Amino acid sequence: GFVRTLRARPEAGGKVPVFVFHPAGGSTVVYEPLLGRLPADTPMYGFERVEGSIEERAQQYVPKLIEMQGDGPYVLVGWSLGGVLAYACAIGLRRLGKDVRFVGLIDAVRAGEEIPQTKEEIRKRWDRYAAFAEKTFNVPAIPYEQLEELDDEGQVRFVLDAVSQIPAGIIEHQRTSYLDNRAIDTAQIQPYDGHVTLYMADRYHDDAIMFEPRYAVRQPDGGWGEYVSDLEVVPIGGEHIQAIDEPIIAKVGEHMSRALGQIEADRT
């Protein structure tokens, strides 16, 4: 289904599992280096891509989380889109009376300026995209009227259909990566009253900034302060793309290992 077992929990008992959520355009295999930097016998399960708005995705994840972990305690972690997903699940779990003890955002940083969801923005985005298409491929008027009334999924299907009028593996990977990135853009963040740990790199990587220049700037709280009063930021430096890998992930893992140790002691 959509649950990957990175490290299975014992048949009974054992430590609290870490649930990780996939990043934009990738799977949860990317959390293996993190897993290497967490305490021994820490179980880990990864939740992979599902369809819908952030809230719709969480509506699919949360029942599964509960089936696997019951009342809690819940440790929810994510890099890239995975961060927003972990957070949405945190809100859903807390609303149903569950015990969420840790939410780990791994450089899941909001654009430094809000990205509006307006028809003007739709037009600016696709104008930007058309221009790069011209330059990258050495190659007309953009049918804005039809695009404005399509959602993101509809917009890319329209552009891809108009394009064919490229092999499927490549189209599918560009498609889901594009939609997962837009899901980050259009996420409507709700407030959460539990503790959030935000691991913060210095900047988005250049390719990220080229697609959406508002990611060139980040606030110090990464845009989460207004939604999260109990917010901790753990600066890790480097770029967004590097935050998930060795050696920077060692810094994340060392800190996160301390948090897990406290959760384990409290149960004891």
Ligand SMILES: CCOC(=O)c1c(-c2ccccc2)oc2ccc(O)c(CN3CCCC3)c12
């Ligand atoms: C090379 C990295 O490309 C992307 O980040 C994005 C992609 C993408 C497309 C095809 C293949 C891979 C990625 O689509 C986007 C749509 C909106 C948007 O704001 C972003 C920018 N990101 C950066 C921070 C979150 C949004 C992207």
